[PDB]
Amino acid sequence: VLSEGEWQLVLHVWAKVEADCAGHGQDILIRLFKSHPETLEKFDRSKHLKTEAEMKASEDLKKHGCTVLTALGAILKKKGHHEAELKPLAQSHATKHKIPIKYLEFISEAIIHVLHSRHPGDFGADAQGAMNKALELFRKDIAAKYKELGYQG
Numbered sequence: 001v002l003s004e005g006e007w008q009l010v011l012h013v014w015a016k017v018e019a020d021c022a023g024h025g026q027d028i029l030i031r032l033f034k035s036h037p038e039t040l041e042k043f044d045r046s047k048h049l050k051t052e053a054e055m056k057a058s059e060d061l062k063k064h065g066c067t068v069l070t071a072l073g074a075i076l077k078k079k080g081h082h083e084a085e086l087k088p089l090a091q092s093h094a095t096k097h098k099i100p101i102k103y104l105e106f107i108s109e110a111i112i113h114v115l116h117s118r119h120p121g122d123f124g125a126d127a128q129g130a131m132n133k134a135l136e137l138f139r140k141d142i143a144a145k146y147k148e149l150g151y152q153g
């Protein structure tokens with residue numbers, strides 16, 4: 001459903017993200033927690049971090065942020081053909097972590113904010129629109145997998 005051109009814009013900016021996995025990952029989570037503090041409660045250890053500096057200095061948050069981006073990167077490189085990649089992720093996020101689709105919207109917003117902040121020249125209107133569609137596709141498909149597992153989140 002995304003055009004080839006749009007996928008290229010997505011993967012163009014993603015190569016930039018990959019130049020600093022920990023950094024982008026960290027800032028996305030920090031942004032998420034700031035914009036939607038209720039999300040922080042999902043994180044057993046990061047829950048207890050009281051300042052921005054503490055979060056910035058957290059190897060936990062760096063490694064988890066990078067883990068999120070690494071999994072998302074693999075999904076986006078499938079260019080929509082991500083049925084296999086979504087299976088274990090829907091399982092864990094539906095039944096174990098219990099992350100509502102709204103929370104995936106929240107983190108999608110965080111991703112777009114961080115990418116625009118760090119890469120404005122490589123993330124203008126068309127690039128943002130393409131990333132928006134890619135993440136919308138992600139959320140739609142993972143929502144369907146949620147329901148197959150009995151989770152109406």
Ligand code: HEM
Pocket residue numbers: 039040042043067068069071072088089092093097099103104107
């Ligand atoms: C782009 C969307 C997301 C991606 C690609 C993603 C990816 C991952 C990956 C790869 C893992 C490790 C393996 C696993 O348990 O599945 C993970 C774990 C986890 N995810 Fe996500 N995630 C996303 C969104 C979220 C959001 C928005 C939340 C909470 C608001 C969340 C909560 C968690 C938690 C609590 C863990 C386990 C952390 C731990 O116990 O160490 N995820 N995620």
